[PDB]
């Protein structure tokens, strides 16, 4: 039992952008055993836009297959755009798909001397199995254009990693972005073996000429069942241009049974270049030290925030001990008038 369906539409007329020649088809087959080979082809002519598609679905009970494609290409007197897509899906025992996105764009506007090029690769590859996950992608692409009000060029590089196998999980990102004015490197590292451990790793590298360099990267080691958690937290930054200085950040601590200790330190000596020839001199000293224990506990807070000619030192020590408890409040400051 099969059906031969065929459609053919002709819009012959004046103007090339308006005339069209559409055609369609459809085929079927199903004798006894359901060996379906359903197919489709979408086709038409039109000077304004040419787009084509063909989808052919295959079925053999457990052998299930699917191939679909849709490609379009825009063309005119100023612009030239294209796109392609391939659906590759097959179902035999497990589930998997690989689909691609081919993106092109070329714009040329001679009115203001503009020429833009965009060209993007968007591909997905998945794998679903009985207890298995295999997921990855790559957002590869680049950009470029010449325009007096906006001129930039660079390459975008993305990669996604994800995989599941049993109680353990895996997940990693490698982001590489590069341009003529901004350069950032990004990495993600994640790992945790169910309720046993948890790996926390961040990688952020920002590079720019006008402001300077920023360095942010930190680690965290977490363990389950006992109460252990230690994160290595830090940051180093540079500022250039209208502002100059440093950003030091200390975030160190250990989470332990019957022992809690935290160390936080924040440093900055920024010098703001205000307009009308004014300079703001900012130096602040923010620190912290923790110790928690069943026997004795303590804390510390010291601030040395200073603005230009206005200095302030604030003293705060907190600590409980059985032999002696200290209680001092340091309130000191000076405001020039």
Curated annotation (Swiss-Prot):
Superkingdom of the source? Eukaryota
Its job:
Apolipoprotein B is a major protein constituent of chylomicrons (apo B-48), LDL (apo B-100) and VLDL (apo B-100). Apo B-100 functions as a recognition signal for the cellular binding and internalization of LDL particles by the apoB/E receptor.
- Localisation: Cytoplasm; Secreted; Lipid droplet
Q: How does it assemble?
A: Interacts with PCSK9. Interacts with MTTP. Interacts with AUP1. Interacts with CIDEB.
Q: What is the name attached to this protein's record?
A: Apolipoprotein B-100
The disease tied to this protein in UniProt is: Hypobetalipoproteinemia, familial, 1: A disorder of lipid metabolism characterized by less than 5th percentile age- and sex-specific levels of low density lipoproteins, and dietary fat malabsorption. Clinical presentation may vary from no symptoms to severe gastrointestinal and neurological dysfunction similar to abetalipoproteinemia.
Q: Which organism is it from?
A: Homo sapiens (Human)
> What residues are glycosylation sites in this protein?
196, 315
> From which residue to which, out of the full length, is covered?
2787 to 3123 of 4563
């Amino acid at each position: 039992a099969g059906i031969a369906a065929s459609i053919t539409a002709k819009g012959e007329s004046k103007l090339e952008v308006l005339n069209f020649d559409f055609q369609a088809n459809a085929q079927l087959s199903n004798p006894k055993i359901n060996p379906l080979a359903l197919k489709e082809s979408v086709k038409f002519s039109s000077k304004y836009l040419r787009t084509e598609h063909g989808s052919e679905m295959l079925f053999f009970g457990n052998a299930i297959e699917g191939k679909s494609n849709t490609v379009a290409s825009l063309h005119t007197e100023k612009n030239t755009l294209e796109l392609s897509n391939g659906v590759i899906v097959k179902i035999n025992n497990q589930l998997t798909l690989d689909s691609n996105t081919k993106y092109f764009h070329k714009l040329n506007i001679p009115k203001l001397d503009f020429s833009s090029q965009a060209d993007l690769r968007n591909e997905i590859k998945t794998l679903l199995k009985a207890g298995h996950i295999a997921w990855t992608s790559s957002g590869k692409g680049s950009w470029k254009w010449a325009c007096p009000r906006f001129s930039d060029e660079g390459t975008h590089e993305s990669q996604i990693s994800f995989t599941i196998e049993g109680p353990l999980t895996s997940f990693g990102l490698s982001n590489k972005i590069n341009s003529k004015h901004l350069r950032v490197n990004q990495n993600l590292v994640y790992e945790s073996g169910s309720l046993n451990f948890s790996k926390l790793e961040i990688q952020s590298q920002v590079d720019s000429q006008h402001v300077g360099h920023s360095v942010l990267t930190a680690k965290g080691m977490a363990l389950f069942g006992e109460g252990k958690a230690e994160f290595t937290g830090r940051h180093d930054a540079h500022l250039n241009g209208k502002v100059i200085g440093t950003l030091k950040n200390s975030l160190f601590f250990s989470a332990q049974p019957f022992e809690i200790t935290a160390s936080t330190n924040n440093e900055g000596n920024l010098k703001v270049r205000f307009p009308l020839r004014l300079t703001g001199k900012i130096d602040f000293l923010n620190n912290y030290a923790l110790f928690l224990s069943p026997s004795a506990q303590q804390a510390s807070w010291q601030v040395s925030a200073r603005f230009n000619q206005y200095k302030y030192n604030q003293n705060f020590s907190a600590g409980n001990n059985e032999n002696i408890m200290e209680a001092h409040v340091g309130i000191n400051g000076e405001a020039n008038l």
